[PDB]
Amino acid sequence: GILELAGTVGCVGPRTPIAYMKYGCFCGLGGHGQPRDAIDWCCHGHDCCYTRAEEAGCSPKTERYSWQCVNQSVLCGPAENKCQELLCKCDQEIANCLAQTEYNLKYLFYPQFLCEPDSPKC
């Protein structure tokens, strides 16, 4: 869920999870368009993963799961079921993705009217 998403992103990356709450065309609730940069690509990929998790019968925004932060890296487990392992994979992946990127301040609170109606495929 969101609690573990916050946790994993701060474990691996150098910045507040607040930095990703309305950013580019994809970072935050929903999203459409051409991704503005690497960070926005990370969020498009996470959007896709969560979509996949939902199609598999999971609730990626609410379901709790255990994990450990060891040397600023995410270890998933123990998992009680398949959904917990999918969810932790999705959050691990975005966390690793975002930790490798430079932040572009200009994309924080970017106008949605500049985001195209079509998106890249998942």
Ligand X SMILES: Cc1cc(-c2cc(C(N)=O)n[nH]2)c(C)s1
Cβ-Cβ contacts under 8 Å for 44 (sequence gap 6 or more): 26, 31, 35, 119, 120
Closest distance of CB 20 from ligand X, Å: 4
Question: Counting contacts by CB under 6 A, is residue 1 touching ligand X?
Answer: no
Both tokens assigned to 82: 């398949």
| Interacting partner of 5 out of Ca ion, ligand X, none (Cβ under 5 to 8 A depending on kind) | ligand X
The stretches of 18-81 forming alpha helices (DSSP H) are: 38-55
- 76 three-class SS: strand
Query: What is the spatial distance between Cα 26 and Cα 36, in angstroms, rounded to a whole number?
Result: 9
Active-site positions read 46, 91
Tell whether 7 is in a known binding site.
Answer: no
Closest distance of CB 31 from Ca ion, Å: 4
Tell whether 45 is in a known binding site.
Answer: no
Instruction: Give the interface size with Ca ion as a residue count (CB under 5 A).
Output: 3
Amino acid code (one letter) for 90: C
Q: Which is nearer to Ca ion, 26 or 67 (CB)?
A: 26
Residues that bind ligand X (CB under 6 A): 2, 5-6, 9, 17, 20-21, 26-28, 31, 43, 46-47, 94
